[PDB]
Scaffold this motif. Structure first.
Motif, PDB file in Angstrom:
ATOM      1  N   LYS A 150       0.841  -1.180   0.000  1.00 43.71           N
ATOM      2  CA  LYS A 150       0.000   0.000   0.000  1.00 43.71           C
ATOM      3  C   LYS A 150       0.894   1.254   0.000  1.00 43.71           C
ATOM      4  O   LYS A 150       2.075   1.171   0.391  1.00 43.71           O
ATOM      5  CB  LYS A 150      -0.906   0.138   1.189  1.00 43.71           C
ATOM      6  CG  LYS A 150      -1.842  -1.051   1.361  1.00 43.71           C
ATOM      7  CD  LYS A 150      -2.546  -1.358   0.062  1.00 43.71           C
ATOM      8  CE  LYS A 150      -4.037  -1.597   0.311  1.00 43.71           C
ATOM      9  NZ  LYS A 150      -4.555  -2.397  -0.821  1.00 43.71           N
ATOM     10  N   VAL A 151       0.322   2.345  -0.432  1.00 47.73           N
ATOM     11  CA  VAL A 151       1.029   3.639  -0.510  1.00 47.73           C
ATOM     12  C   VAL A 151       0.823   4.467   0.769  1.00 47.73           C
ATOM     13  O   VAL A 151       1.672   5.215   1.233  1.00 47.73           O
ATOM     14  CB  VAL A 151       0.493   4.419  -1.759  1.00 47.73           C
ATOM     15  CG1 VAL A 151       0.854   5.886  -1.683  1.00 47.73           C
ATOM     16  CG2 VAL A 151       0.866   3.800  -3.094  1.00 47.73           C
ATOM     17  N   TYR A 152      -0.414   4.403   1.264  1.00 47.05           N
ATOM     18  CA  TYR A 152      -0.904   5.106   2.416  1.00 47.05           C
ATOM     19  C   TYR A 152      -0.796   4.317   3.699  1.00 47.05           C
ATOM     20  O   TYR A 152      -1.800   4.065   4.359  1.00 47.05           O
ATOM     21  CB  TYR A 152      -2.323   5.727   2.158  1.00 47.05           C
ATOM     22  CG  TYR A 152      -2.005   6.857   1.212  1.00 47.05           C
ATOM     23  CD1 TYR A 152      -1.202   7.943   1.618  1.00 47.05           C
ATOM     24  CD2 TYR A 152      -2.456   6.777  -0.117  1.00 47.05           C
ATOM     25  CE1 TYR A 152      -0.907   8.975   0.710  1.00 47.05           C
ATOM     26  CE2 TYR A 152      -2.140   7.782  -1.033  1.00 47.05           C
ATOM     27  CZ  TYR A 152      -1.396   8.874  -0.611  1.00 47.05           C
ATOM     28  OH  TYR A 152      -1.113   9.808  -1.578  1.00 47.05           O
TER      29      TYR A 152
ATOM     30  N   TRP B 193     -10.399   8.615   6.065  1.00 45.87           N
ATOM     31  CA  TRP B 193     -10.663   7.169   5.928  1.00 45.87           C
ATOM     32  C   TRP B 193      -9.546   6.412   6.674  1.00 45.87           C
ATOM     33  O   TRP B 193      -8.688   7.029   7.339  1.00 45.87           O
ATOM     34  CB  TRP B 193     -10.730   6.785   4.392  1.00 45.87           C
ATOM     35  CG  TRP B 193      -9.439   7.152   3.709  1.00 45.87           C
ATOM     36  CD1 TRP B 193      -9.028   8.441   3.372  1.00 45.87           C
ATOM     37  CD2 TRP B 193      -8.320   6.340   3.372  1.00 45.87           C
ATOM     38  NE1 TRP B 193      -7.730   8.467   2.871  1.00 45.87           N
ATOM     39  CE2 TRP B 193      -7.319   7.169   2.825  1.00 45.87           C
ATOM     40  CE3 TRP B 193      -8.086   4.982   3.468  1.00 45.87           C
ATOM     41  CZ2 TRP B 193      -6.079   6.687   2.396  1.00 45.87           C
ATOM     42  CZ3 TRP B 193      -6.892   4.453   3.005  1.00 45.87           C
ATOM     43  CH2 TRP B 193      -5.886   5.323   2.524  1.00 45.87           C
TER      44      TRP B 193
HETATM   45 CL   LIG Z   1      -2.974   3.205  -0.124  1.00 42.06          CL
END
Ligand SMILES: [Cl-]
Length: 86
Positions: free
Chosen positions: A35-37, A65
């Motif tokens: 994931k990036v976040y 979120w």
């Molecule tokens: Cl993400």
């Protein structure tokens, strides 16, 4: 705070509950690898992404979120923070 302003990109509260009533995964979870976040984001500090599971808006989404497990499946979902405008 008790609410998010705009899209909550500046939100830095402790809400850790999604719309569906599910608790957010922490940003440093092993489950979010790829994931990036995540907390391992190069800008994790600037985004409020760390060793917590608090609702954030690090990507210009509609409102704060978080990543969640939806019956053992990894998704994400908007959180339950009321808008400062609602
Ligand atoms: Cl993400």
């Amino acid at each position: 705070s008790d609410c998010y302003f705009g899209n909550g990109s500046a939100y830095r509260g402790t809400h850790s509950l999604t719309e569906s009533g599910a608790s957010c995964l922490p940003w440093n979870s092993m489950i979010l690898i790829g994931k990036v976040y995540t907390a391992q984001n190069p800008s994790a500090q600037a985004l409020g992404l760390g060793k917590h599971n608090y609702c954030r808006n690090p990507d210009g989404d509609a409102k704060p979120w978080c990543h969640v497990l939806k019956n053992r499946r990894l998704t994400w979902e908007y959180c339950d923070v009321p808008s400062c405008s609602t």
